[PDB]
């Protein structure tokens, strides 16, 4: 509740000490040296299958927003790529910047771009979330970057119900999202091995992390800005730079989907 978040005294330089597993061999984000990261040519296109997508509700869970889909059959489904069976679309969320020069997790060649999208996936061999996560190949996260410029109209609708969760706890009925409107055109990737970016930072995580970035307008970035990380009736804390930074790479190789 105030023990982990991203001020001064709580972000994500502290973070170890409730969840050791934070400087462990797998964590989240790195720095995609775009040199380093080899192709590898035995990596299938990834396979998104979110025609049959539910989403249900958006929530301000306090670091971020979650828009939460239906995940009792297999509906929005992420396949391929680095994968090995299916996995179910649980949520996603974004992590962005108080201004437009930093607000990534994942960093291109060091460049930071103003905010990142997380679609977040569970393995169905697991059961449910709960057990997957405890699971190596438990999860899969497709990583997609935000840049500043034209505005996109498949997250305005987002943008729009914010002003209704500005606060953490609250949440809103948001039935009907269609999160393929938050894809770029290439799902070129590059893919590794890798953990949760928010406690408790579980080392679960297939990465997928997409080359192309989208593009926001200055407008729609500046709604995010306008969140809350605190509750109603709590001082204002703007929900800005809940992004952790790059972590070490260690003994891991970022494999590219493309040449
Ligand atoms: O928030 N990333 O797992
Ligand atoms: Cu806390
Ligand atoms: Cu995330």
């Known amino acids: 509740s105030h023990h982990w ?6 972000g994500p330089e502290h ?15 790195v720095d995609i040296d775009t040199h380093t990261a080899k192709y590898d040519p035995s990596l299938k296109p990834l396979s998104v299958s979110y025609d049959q997508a539910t989403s249900l509700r958006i929530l301000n869970n306090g670091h971020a927003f979650n828009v939460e889909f239906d995940d009792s059959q297999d509906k929005a489904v992420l396949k391929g790529g680095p994968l090995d069976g299916t996995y179910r679309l649980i949520q996603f969320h974004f992590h962005w910047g108080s201004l437009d020069g930093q607000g990534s ?5 060091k460049k930071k771009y103003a905010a990142e999208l997380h679609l977040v996936h569970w393995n169905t061999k697991y059961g449910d979330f709960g057990k997957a996560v405890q699971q190596p190949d438990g999860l899969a996260v497709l990583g997609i970057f935000l840049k500043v410029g034209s505005a996109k109209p498949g997250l305005q609708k987002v943008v729009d119900v914010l002003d209704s969760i500005k606060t953490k706890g609250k949440s809103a009925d948001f039935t009907n999202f269609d999160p393929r409107g938050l894809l770029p055109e290439s799902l070129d990737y590059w893919t590794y091995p890798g953990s949760l970016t928010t406690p408790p930072l579980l080392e679960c995580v297939t990465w997928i992390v997409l080359k192309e970035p989208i593009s926001v307008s ?6 995010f800005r306008k969140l809350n990380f605190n509750g109603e009736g709590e001082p204002e804390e703007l929900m800005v730079d809940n ?17």
């Open 243 to 259: 992004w952790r930074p790059a972590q070490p790479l260690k003994n891991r190789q970022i494999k590219a989907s493309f040449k």
């Open 15 to 29: 973070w170890h000490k409730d969840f050791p597993i934070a400087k462990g061999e797998r964590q989240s984000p």
């Open 218 to 223: 200055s407008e729609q970035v500046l709604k």
């Open 5 to 10: 978040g991203y001020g001064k005294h709580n």
């Open 105 to 109: 997790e994942h960093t291109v060649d």
